[PDB]
Design an enzyme around this catalytic site. Structure first.
Site: not given
Ligand SMILES: [Cl-]
Ligand SMILES: [Cl-]
Ligand SMILES: [Cl-]
Ligand SMILES: [Cl-]
Ligand SMILES: [Cl-]
Length: 506
Positions: A17, A238, A248
Protein backbone atom coordinates in the site's frame (compact mmCIF):
# COMPACT_ATOMS: atom_id res chain seq x y z
CA UNK A 1 5.47 -22.23 -3.53
CA UNK A 2 5.78 -22.44 -7.26
CA UNK A 3 3.10 -24.94 -8.25
CA UNK A 4 3.58 -25.79 -11.95
CA UNK A 5 6.03 -22.92 -12.42
CA UNK A 6 7.56 -22.78 -15.91
CA UNK A 7 11.15 -21.54 -16.33
CA UNK A 8 11.14 -18.19 -18.08
CA UNK A 9 7.38 -17.77 -17.56
CA UNK A 10 6.85 -16.92 -13.87
CA UNK A 11 5.35 -13.54 -12.90
CA UNK A 12 5.19 -12.53 -9.23
CA UNK A 13 4.25 -9.24 -7.69
CA UNK A 14 5.04 -7.23 -4.60
CA UNK A 15 1.93 -5.14 -3.74
CA UNK A 16 2.55 -2.66 -0.90
CA UNK A 17 0.00 0.00 0.00
CA UNK A 18 1.40 3.47 -0.85
CA UNK A 19 0.28 5.16 2.38
CA UNK A 20 3.32 4.31 4.50
CA UNK A 21 7.03 3.58 4.59
CA UNK A 22 8.32 0.07 3.94
CA UNK A 23 9.00 -1.80 7.19
CA UNK A 24 10.57 -5.18 8.02
CA UNK A 25 7.22 -6.92 7.55
CA UNK A 26 7.25 -5.83 3.90
CA UNK A 27 10.74 -7.23 3.57
CA UNK A 28 9.86 -10.92 3.63
CA UNK A 29 7.17 -10.29 1.00
CA UNK A 30 9.47 -8.30 -1.28
CA UNK A 31 12.28 -10.79 -0.88
CA UNK A 32 10.21 -13.93 -1.46
CA UNK A 33 8.56 -12.44 -4.55
CA UNK A 34 12.01 -11.63 -5.95
CA UNK A 35 13.53 -14.98 -4.84
CA UNK A 36 10.87 -16.98 -6.64
CA UNK A 37 10.92 -14.81 -9.78
CA UNK A 38 14.70 -15.23 -10.02
CA UNK A 39 14.50 -18.96 -9.22
CA UNK A 40 12.35 -19.41 -12.33
CA UNK A 41 14.00 -16.75 -14.58
CA UNK A 42 10.79 -14.73 -14.49
CA UNK A 43 9.78 -11.22 -13.52
CA UNK A 44 8.40 -9.38 -10.50
CA UNK A 45 5.84 -6.61 -10.76
CA UNK A 46 5.60 -3.70 -8.35
CA UNK A 47 2.01 -2.78 -7.63
CA UNK A 48 0.89 -0.02 -5.35
CA UNK A 49 -2.20 -1.42 -3.62
CA UNK A 50 -4.46 1.63 -3.49
CA UNK A 51 -7.88 0.03 -3.85
CA UNK A 52 -9.54 2.24 -1.24
CA UNK A 53 -9.17 5.96 -0.46
CA UNK A 54 -6.92 7.02 2.41
CA UNK A 55 -5.82 10.32 3.93
CA UNK A 56 -2.06 10.27 3.30
CA UNK A 57 0.28 12.87 4.81
CA UNK A 58 2.70 12.02 1.95
CA UNK A 59 3.19 10.26 -1.37
CA UNK A 60 5.26 7.31 -0.16
CA UNK A 61 5.80 5.89 -3.67
CA UNK A 62 9.28 7.44 -3.99
CA UNK A 63 10.49 6.16 -0.63
CA UNK A 64 9.16 2.65 -1.33
CA UNK A 65 10.99 2.69 -4.68
CA UNK A 66 14.29 3.72 -3.15
CA UNK A 67 14.02 1.18 -0.29
CA UNK A 68 13.44 -1.55 -2.88
CA UNK A 69 16.53 -0.39 -4.75
CA UNK A 70 18.56 -0.42 -1.50
CA UNK A 71 17.52 -4.05 -0.99
CA UNK A 72 18.71 -4.92 -4.51
CA UNK A 73 15.19 -5.94 -5.57
CA UNK A 74 14.21 -4.90 -9.06
CA UNK A 75 10.79 -5.07 -10.68
CA UNK A 76 9.84 -5.11 -14.33
CA UNK A 77 6.94 -2.67 -14.22
CA UNK A 78 4.99 -0.53 -11.78
CA UNK A 79 1.19 -0.30 -11.61
CA UNK A 80 -1.54 0.84 -9.23
CA UNK A 81 -4.58 -1.22 -8.28
CA UNK A 82 -6.61 1.93 -9.05
CA UNK A 83 -5.41 1.65 -12.65
CA UNK A 84 -8.13 -1.06 -13.04
CA UNK A 85 -11.20 0.55 -11.43
CA UNK A 86 -13.15 0.78 -14.71
CA UNK A 87 -12.39 -2.83 -15.54
CA UNK A 88 -13.40 -3.87 -12.04
CA UNK A 89 -16.73 -2.04 -12.40
CA UNK A 90 -17.22 -3.90 -15.68
CA UNK A 91 -16.61 -7.15 -13.87
CA UNK A 92 -18.93 -6.23 -11.03
CA UNK A 93 -21.73 -5.71 -13.54
CA UNK A 94 -20.80 -9.05 -15.11
CA UNK A 95 -21.14 -10.65 -11.69
CA UNK A 96 -24.55 -9.04 -11.26
CA UNK A 97 -25.80 -10.25 -14.65
CA UNK A 98 -24.77 -13.87 -13.91
CA UNK A 99 -26.66 -13.64 -10.59
CA UNK A 100 -23.33 -14.02 -8.77
CA UNK A 101 -23.57 -10.67 -6.97
CA UNK A 102 -26.30 -8.59 -5.40
CA UNK A 103 -26.75 -5.19 -3.78
CA UNK A 104 -27.43 -5.19 -0.04
CA UNK A 105 -28.58 -2.24 2.09
CA UNK A 106 -28.36 -4.19 5.38
CA UNK A 107 -26.58 -2.39 8.21
CA UNK A 108 -23.09 -3.21 9.46
CA UNK A 109 -24.16 -5.01 12.64
CA UNK A 110 -27.09 -6.96 11.17
CA UNK A 111 -24.82 -8.05 8.30
CA UNK A 112 -22.04 -9.27 10.60
CA UNK A 113 -24.54 -11.20 12.73
CA UNK A 114 -26.35 -12.70 9.74
CA UNK A 115 -22.99 -13.90 8.39
CA UNK A 116 -22.12 -15.39 11.77
CA UNK A 117 -25.27 -17.51 11.85
CA UNK A 118 -25.42 -18.05 8.09
CA UNK A 119 -28.82 -16.48 7.40
CA UNK A 120 -29.27 -15.08 3.91
CA UNK A 121 -29.91 -11.36 3.51
CA UNK A 122 -33.38 -10.25 2.34
CA UNK A 123 -31.72 -8.83 -0.78
CA UNK A 124 -29.98 -12.10 -1.69
CA UNK A 125 -32.83 -12.80 -4.16
CA UNK A 126 -33.02 -9.27 -5.61
CA UNK A 127 -33.56 -9.17 -9.36
CA UNK A 128 -30.67 -8.66 -11.77
CA UNK A 129 -32.19 -5.40 -13.03
CA UNK A 130 -32.67 -4.19 -9.44
CA UNK A 131 -29.12 -5.12 -8.45
CA UNK A 132 -27.97 -3.13 -11.48
CA UNK A 133 -30.11 -0.11 -10.60
CA UNK A 134 -28.66 -0.12 -7.09
CA UNK A 135 -25.07 -0.55 -8.28
CA UNK A 136 -25.59 2.51 -10.46
CA UNK A 137 -26.92 4.28 -7.35
CA UNK A 138 -23.59 3.48 -5.69
CA UNK A 139 -21.66 4.53 -8.80
CA UNK A 140 -23.20 8.00 -8.75
CA UNK A 141 -22.86 8.33 -4.96
CA UNK A 142 -26.47 9.12 -4.03
CA UNK A 143 -28.14 8.83 -0.63
CA UNK A 144 -29.42 5.39 -1.69
CA UNK A 145 -26.01 4.43 -3.04
CA UNK A 146 -24.17 5.23 0.19
CA UNK A 147 -26.56 2.88 2.03
CA UNK A 148 -25.72 -0.03 -0.33
CA UNK A 149 -22.78 -2.33 -0.93
CA UNK A 150 -22.34 -5.07 -3.51
CA UNK A 151 -21.74 -8.55 -2.20
CA UNK A 152 -20.81 -11.73 -3.84
CA UNK A 153 -23.40 -14.39 -4.03
CA UNK A 154 -21.59 -17.42 -2.87
CA UNK A 155 -22.69 -19.81 -0.13
CA UNK A 156 -24.04 -18.61 3.15
CA UNK A 157 -23.78 -21.96 4.82
CA UNK A 158 -20.22 -22.54 3.90
CA UNK A 159 -17.90 -23.69 6.55
CA UNK A 160 -15.55 -20.94 5.35
CA UNK A 161 -16.57 -17.49 6.64
CA UNK A 162 -14.90 -15.84 3.61
CA UNK A 163 -17.32 -17.71 1.32
CA UNK A 164 -20.44 -16.25 2.99
CA UNK A 165 -21.15 -13.41 0.57
CA UNK A 166 -18.05 -11.19 0.94
CA UNK A 167 -18.40 -7.52 0.05
CA UNK A 168 -17.12 -6.63 -3.43
CA UNK A 169 -17.85 -2.91 -3.74
CA UNK A 170 -18.37 -0.12 -1.24
CA UNK A 171 -19.64 3.40 -1.74
CA UNK A 172 -17.27 6.02 -0.28
CA UNK A 173 -17.92 9.71 -1.00
CA UNK A 174 -16.23 11.57 1.86
CA UNK A 175 -12.54 10.65 1.62
CA UNK A 176 -10.83 11.48 -1.70
CA UNK A 177 -8.57 8.99 -3.44
CA UNK A 178 -4.93 10.04 -3.69
CA UNK A 179 -5.03 9.57 -7.49
CA UNK A 180 -8.62 10.17 -8.66
CA UNK A 181 -9.89 12.53 -5.91
CA UNK A 182 -13.71 12.25 -5.97
CA UNK A 183 -13.97 10.92 -9.54
CA UNK A 184 -14.91 7.50 -8.15
CA UNK A 185 -17.85 7.14 -5.76
CA UNK A 186 -17.58 3.36 -5.32
CA UNK A 187 -14.49 1.28 -4.80
CA UNK A 188 -13.85 -2.45 -5.02
CA UNK A 189 -12.77 -4.23 -1.90
CA UNK A 190 -9.37 -5.85 -1.56
CA UNK A 191 -10.87 -9.36 -1.78
CA UNK A 192 -12.56 -8.59 -5.11
CA UNK A 193 -9.81 -6.46 -6.67
CA UNK A 194 -6.91 -8.78 -5.82
CA UNK A 195 -7.69 -11.93 -7.91
CA UNK A 196 -8.94 -9.95 -10.92
CA UNK A 197 -5.96 -7.59 -11.02
CA UNK A 198 -3.60 -10.55 -10.59
CA UNK A 199 -5.22 -12.38 -13.48
CA UNK A 200 -5.34 -9.42 -15.83
CA UNK A 201 -1.78 -8.19 -15.04
CA UNK A 202 -0.38 -11.58 -16.01
CA UNK A 203 0.63 -12.77 -12.53
CA UNK A 204 1.23 -16.50 -12.45
CA UNK A 205 2.13 -16.93 -8.77
CA UNK A 206 0.59 -14.64 -6.19
CA UNK A 207 2.29 -14.65 -2.79
CA UNK A 208 0.66 -13.40 0.37
CA UNK A 209 0.99 -13.52 4.13
CA UNK A 210 -1.20 -16.09 5.83
CA UNK A 211 -4.03 -14.17 7.46
CA UNK A 212 -5.31 -17.45 8.98
CA UNK A 213 -8.60 -17.13 7.11
CA UNK A 214 -9.06 -19.33 4.05
CA UNK A 215 -9.12 -16.43 1.63
CA UNK A 216 -7.54 -18.74 -0.97
CA UNK A 217 -10.84 -20.55 -1.66
CA UNK A 218 -12.59 -17.19 -2.16
CA UNK A 219 -9.80 -15.82 -4.41
CA UNK A 220 -10.13 -18.94 -6.58
CA UNK A 221 -13.92 -18.66 -6.63
CA UNK A 222 -13.71 -15.16 -8.05
CA UNK A 223 -11.30 -16.27 -10.77
CA UNK A 224 -13.33 -19.36 -11.72
CA UNK A 225 -16.74 -17.63 -11.45
CA UNK A 226 -15.55 -14.96 -13.88
CA UNK A 227 -13.71 -17.33 -16.28
CA UNK A 228 -10.38 -15.53 -15.99
CA UNK A 229 -6.93 -16.89 -16.69
CA UNK A 230 -5.98 -18.81 -13.55
CA UNK A 231 -3.43 -17.61 -10.96
CA UNK A 232 -1.73 -19.74 -8.30
CA UNK A 233 -1.78 -18.27 -4.82
CA UNK A 234 0.41 -19.39 -1.92
CA UNK A 235 0.46 -17.96 1.60
CA UNK A 236 3.72 -17.69 3.60
CA UNK A 237 4.30 -16.83 7.27
CA UNK A 238 4.44 -13.22 8.43
CA UNK A 239 7.79 -11.83 9.68
CA UNK A 240 7.35 -9.84 12.90
CA UNK A 241 9.72 -9.23 15.81
CA UNK A 242 9.29 -8.84 19.56
CA UNK A 243 9.40 -5.42 21.23
CA UNK A 244 8.54 -3.75 17.92
CA UNK A 245 5.74 -1.24 17.45
CA UNK A 246 4.02 -1.75 14.10
CA UNK A 247 0.77 0.13 14.78
CA UNK A 248 0.99 3.28 12.65
CA UNK A 249 -0.93 5.03 15.30
CA UNK A 250 1.66 4.44 17.95
CA UNK A 251 4.57 5.12 15.57
CA UNK A 252 3.21 8.56 14.75
CA UNK A 253 2.61 9.00 18.49
CA UNK A 254 6.36 8.51 18.99
CA UNK A 255 7.23 11.02 16.26
CA UNK A 256 4.83 13.69 17.55
CA UNK A 257 5.76 13.38 21.23
CA UNK A 258 9.51 13.62 20.43
CA UNK A 259 10.45 10.14 21.54
CA UNK A 260 12.14 9.89 18.17
CA UNK A 261 12.73 12.72 15.70
CA UNK A 262 11.73 11.03 12.40
CA UNK A 263 10.55 7.82 10.75
CA UNK A 264 14.20 7.04 9.93
CA UNK A 265 15.20 6.83 13.61
CA UNK A 266 17.25 3.64 14.14
CA UNK A 267 14.70 2.20 16.62
CA UNK A 268 11.92 2.24 14.05
CA UNK A 269 10.99 -0.93 12.15
CA UNK A 270 11.20 0.85 8.76
CA UNK A 271 13.68 -0.50 6.23
CA UNK A 272 15.59 2.80 6.35
CA UNK A 273 15.82 2.86 10.14
CA UNK A 274 17.13 -0.68 10.38
CA UNK A 275 19.65 -0.20 7.60
CA UNK A 276 20.74 2.92 9.54
CA UNK A 277 21.12 0.62 12.56
CA UNK A 278 23.69 -1.40 10.55
CA UNK A 279 21.76 -4.39 9.15
CA UNK A 280 22.94 -5.71 5.78
CA UNK A 281 20.42 -6.82 3.20
CA UNK A 282 22.42 -10.06 2.99
CA UNK A 283 21.71 -10.77 6.66
CA UNK A 284 17.99 -10.00 6.28
CA UNK A 285 17.62 -12.33 3.32
CA UNK A 286 19.69 -15.12 4.87
CA UNK A 287 17.59 -14.89 8.03
CA UNK A 288 14.41 -15.12 5.93
CA UNK A 289 15.60 -18.16 3.95
CA UNK A 290 16.72 -19.96 7.11
CA UNK A 291 13.90 -19.08 9.55
CA UNK A 292 11.36 -21.73 8.56
CA UNK A 293 7.64 -21.36 9.08
CA UNK A 294 6.05 -19.80 12.13
CA UNK A 295 2.60 -20.23 13.52
CA UNK A 296 -0.09 -17.58 14.00
CA UNK A 297 1.02 -14.46 15.82
CA UNK A 298 4.48 -15.66 16.81
CA UNK A 299 7.23 -13.06 17.09
CA UNK A 300 10.91 -13.58 16.22
CA UNK A 301 13.80 -12.64 18.47
CA UNK A 302 16.37 -10.18 17.12
CA UNK A 303 19.38 -12.19 18.26
CA UNK A 304 19.76 -14.58 15.34
CA UNK A 305 19.29 -11.75 12.85
CA UNK A 306 22.08 -9.67 14.38
CA UNK A 307 24.27 -12.79 14.79
CA UNK A 308 23.93 -13.60 11.08
CA UNK A 309 24.71 -9.97 10.32
CA UNK A 310 27.78 -10.21 12.58
CA UNK A 311 29.06 -13.33 10.81
CA UNK A 312 28.60 -11.49 7.52
CA UNK A 313 30.30 -8.21 8.37
CA UNK A 314 33.12 -9.31 10.72
CA UNK A 315 35.49 -10.51 7.93
CA UNK A 316 35.03 -7.58 5.52
CA UNK A 317 35.19 -4.43 7.71
CA UNK A 318 38.20 -2.50 9.11
CA UNK A 319 39.15 -2.35 12.79
CA UNK A 320 40.05 0.88 14.69
CA UNK A 321 40.50 1.95 18.32
CA UNK A 322 38.57 4.39 20.51
CA UNK A 323 38.69 5.54 24.13
CA UNK A 324 36.31 7.49 26.36
CA UNK A 325 37.07 11.14 25.69
CA UNK A 326 36.40 12.62 29.13
CA UNK A 327 37.66 9.79 31.38
CA UNK A 328 40.62 8.51 29.34
CA UNK A 329 43.85 8.25 31.35
CA UNK A 330 47.29 9.45 30.21
CA UNK A 331 49.94 6.72 30.04
CA UNK A 332 53.62 7.65 29.67
CA UNK A 333 56.39 5.29 28.50
CA UNK A 334 59.27 7.11 30.23
CA UNK A 335 62.00 5.43 28.17
CA UNK A 336 60.79 6.82 24.83
CA UNK A 337 61.03 10.18 23.09
CA UNK A 338 58.16 12.43 22.05
CA UNK A 339 59.14 11.92 18.40
CA UNK A 340 56.08 10.62 16.59
CA UNK A 341 56.67 7.25 14.93
CA UNK A 342 54.38 6.10 12.09
CA UNK A 343 54.03 2.41 11.10
CA UNK A 344 51.87 0.66 8.49
CA UNK A 345 49.36 -1.96 9.67
CA UNK A 346 46.62 -3.94 8.01
CA UNK A 347 43.10 -2.64 8.40
CA UNK A 348 42.17 -6.28 9.03
CA UNK A 349 44.62 -8.81 10.46
CA UNK A 350 43.00 -11.61 8.39
CA UNK A 351 41.95 -9.75 5.24
CA UNK A 352 44.85 -7.83 3.67
CA UNK A 353 42.41 -7.11 0.84
CA UNK A 354 40.87 -4.14 2.69
CA UNK A 355 44.35 -2.65 2.80
CA UNK A 356 46.54 -0.68 5.18
CA UNK A 357 46.31 2.12 7.73
CA UNK A 358 48.88 4.33 9.49
CA UNK A 359 49.53 3.87 13.22
CA UNK A 360 51.05 6.82 15.12
CA UNK A 361 52.70 6.52 18.53
CA UNK A 362 54.70 8.50 20.99
CA UNK A 363 55.88 8.44 24.53
CA UNK A 364 52.30 9.45 25.47
CA UNK A 365 49.11 7.39 25.20
CA UNK A 366 45.47 7.36 26.31
CA UNK A 367 43.82 4.27 27.76
CA UNK A 368 40.46 3.35 29.25
CA UNK A 369 39.92 4.19 32.92
CA UNK A 370 38.57 0.72 33.66
CA UNK A 371 41.76 -0.64 32.12
CA UNK A 372 43.93 1.70 34.20
CA UNK A 373 42.16 0.59 37.40
CA UNK A 374 43.22 -3.04 36.89
CA UNK A 375 46.87 -2.14 36.32
CA UNK A 376 49.36 -2.43 39.15
CA UNK A 377 53.09 -1.99 39.37
CA UNK A 378 55.57 -4.09 37.37
CA UNK A 379 52.75 -5.72 35.40
CA UNK A 380 53.57 -6.79 31.83
CA UNK A 381 50.65 -6.04 29.51
CA UNK A 382 50.31 -5.67 25.72
CA UNK A 383 49.36 -2.52 23.84
CA UNK A 384 47.52 -4.23 20.99
CA UNK A 385 49.14 -3.88 17.54
CA UNK A 386 52.15 -2.27 19.27
CA UNK A 387 53.89 -4.42 21.89
CA UNK A 388 54.35 -5.30 25.53
CA UNK A 389 54.87 -2.69 28.24
CA UNK A 390 55.65 -2.91 31.95
CA UNK A 391 53.71 -0.59 34.25
CA UNK A 392 55.85 1.24 36.71
CA UNK A 393 53.82 3.53 38.91
CA UNK A 394 50.13 4.51 39.11
CA UNK A 395 50.01 8.24 39.94
CA UNK A 396 46.65 8.68 41.70
CA UNK A 397 45.71 12.11 43.08
CA UNK A 398 42.83 12.04 45.63
CA UNK A 399 41.53 8.70 44.37
CA UNK A 400 41.05 9.80 40.75
CA UNK A 401 43.92 8.20 38.84
CA UNK A 402 45.75 11.02 37.06
CA UNK A 403 48.67 9.28 35.32
CA UNK A 404 50.37 5.98 34.69
CA UNK A 405 54.11 5.75 34.11
CA UNK A 406 55.42 2.63 32.34
CA UNK A 407 58.27 1.52 30.19
CA UNK A 408 58.43 0.20 26.64
CA UNK A 409 59.25 -3.51 26.35
CA UNK A 410 57.97 -3.97 22.81
CA UNK A 411 60.28 -6.86 21.94
CA UNK A 412 58.90 -8.99 24.76
CA UNK A 413 56.78 -12.03 23.98
CA UNK A 414 53.18 -10.94 23.39
CA UNK A 415 52.03 -14.42 24.50
CA UNK A 416 53.45 -14.23 28.06
CA UNK A 417 50.87 -11.57 28.90
CA UNK A 418 47.19 -12.00 29.67
CA UNK A 419 46.07 -8.32 29.64
CA UNK A 420 45.87 -7.03 26.05
CA UNK A 421 44.45 -3.49 25.85
CA UNK A 422 43.69 -0.90 23.20
CA UNK A 423 45.10 2.62 23.22
CA UNK A 424 45.28 5.91 21.37
CA UNK A 425 48.41 8.01 20.88
CA UNK A 426 48.12 11.22 22.85
CA UNK A 427 48.00 13.46 19.77
CA UNK A 428 44.92 15.57 20.54
CA UNK A 429 45.22 17.67 17.41
CA UNK A 430 44.91 14.47 15.34
CA UNK A 431 42.46 12.33 17.31
CA UNK A 432 38.93 12.18 15.88
CA UNK A 433 36.11 13.16 18.24
CA UNK A 434 33.02 10.94 17.88
CA UNK A 435 29.57 10.58 19.42
CA UNK A 436 28.52 6.95 19.97
CA UNK A 437 24.79 6.07 19.85
CA UNK A 438 23.75 2.81 21.52
CA UNK A 439 20.07 2.25 20.89
CA UNK A 440 17.51 0.09 22.64
CA UNK A 441 13.97 -1.01 21.90
CA UNK A 442 11.21 1.56 22.13
CA UNK A 443 8.98 -0.78 24.21
CA UNK A 444 9.78 -3.13 27.08
CA UNK A 445 7.20 -5.87 26.37
CA UNK A 446 7.33 -8.36 23.50
CA UNK A 447 3.73 -7.50 22.57
CA UNK A 448 0.75 -5.51 23.84
CA UNK A 449 -2.07 2.57 28.93
CA UNK A 450 0.56 1.28 26.50
CA UNK A 451 2.62 4.44 27.22
CA UNK A 452 3.55 2.62 30.45
CA UNK A 453 5.91 0.29 28.54
CA UNK A 454 7.73 2.89 26.41
CA UNK A 455 11.47 3.05 27.02
CA UNK A 456 11.92 6.81 26.81
CA UNK A 457 15.57 6.27 27.78
CA UNK A 458 16.53 4.23 24.73
CA UNK A 459 19.16 6.45 22.99
CA UNK A 460 22.46 6.40 24.90
CA UNK A 461 25.11 8.86 23.71
CA UNK A 462 28.77 8.84 24.76
CA UNK A 463 31.78 10.86 23.57
CA UNK A 464 35.04 9.21 22.51
CA UNK A 465 38.40 9.86 20.92
CA UNK A 466 39.25 7.70 17.97
CA UNK A 467 42.41 7.08 16.06
CA UNK A 468 43.31 9.40 13.30
CA UNK A 469 43.08 6.93 10.56
CA UNK A 470 39.33 6.74 11.00
CA UNK A 471 39.22 10.04 9.09
CA UNK A 472 39.18 7.97 5.87
CA UNK A 473 35.78 6.41 6.56
CA UNK A 474 32.86 7.62 4.50
CA UNK A 475 29.25 7.80 5.57
CA UNK A 476 27.60 4.35 6.00
CA UNK A 477 30.96 2.56 6.31
CA UNK A 478 30.79 -0.26 8.90
CA UNK A 479 33.73 -1.13 11.16
CA UNK A 480 34.85 -2.54 14.49
CA UNK A 481 36.12 -0.65 17.54
CA UNK A 482 38.60 -2.82 19.41
CA UNK A 483 37.04 -4.35 22.52
CA UNK A 484 33.95 -2.14 22.03
CA UNK A 485 31.88 -3.57 19.18
CA UNK A 486 30.57 -3.00 15.69
CA UNK A 487 29.57 0.43 14.43
CA UNK A 488 28.35 2.23 11.35
CA UNK A 489 29.27 5.80 10.41
CA UNK A 490 25.95 7.67 10.30
CA UNK A 491 26.95 11.32 9.87
CA UNK A 492 30.06 13.52 9.54
CA UNK A 493 29.45 16.78 11.40
CA UNK A 494 31.45 20.00 11.05
CA UNK A 495 35.10 19.68 12.17
CA UNK A 496 35.00 15.98 11.16
CA UNK A 497 33.03 15.08 14.29
CA UNK A 498 31.77 11.54 13.60
CA UNK A 499 28.37 10.15 14.62
CA UNK A 500 28.55 6.40 15.02
CA UNK A 501 25.71 3.96 15.65
CA UNK A 502 26.52 0.80 17.55
CA UNK A 503 25.35 -2.26 15.59
CA UNK A 504 23.64 -4.91 17.75
CA UNK A 505 25.70 -8.10 17.62
CA UNK A 506 23.40 -10.76 19.17
CL1 LIG B 1 -17.39 -6.96 5.93
CL1 LIG C 1 6.15 -20.33 5.16
CL1 LIG D 1 1.43 -2.32 17.54
CL1 LIG E 1 17.91 11.27 13.99
CL1 LIG F 1 39.16 -8.27 27.82
Amino acid sequence: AMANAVIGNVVTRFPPEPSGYLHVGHAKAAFLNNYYAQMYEGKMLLRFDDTNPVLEDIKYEKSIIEDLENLGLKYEKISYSSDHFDLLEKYCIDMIKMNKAYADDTGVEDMRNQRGEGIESINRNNSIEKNLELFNEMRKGTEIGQKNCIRAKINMQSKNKCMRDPVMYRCIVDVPHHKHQFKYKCYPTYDFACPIIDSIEGVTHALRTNEYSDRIEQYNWFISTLNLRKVYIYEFSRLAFVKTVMSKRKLKWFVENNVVDSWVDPRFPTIKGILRRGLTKEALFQFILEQGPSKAGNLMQWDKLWSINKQIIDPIIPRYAAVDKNSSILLILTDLTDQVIQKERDLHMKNKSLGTCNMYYNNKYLIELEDAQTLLENEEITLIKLGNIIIKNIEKENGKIKQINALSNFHGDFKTTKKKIHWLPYLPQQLITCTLYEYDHLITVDKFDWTNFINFNSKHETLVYAEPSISSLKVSDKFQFERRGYFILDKIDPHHHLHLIKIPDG
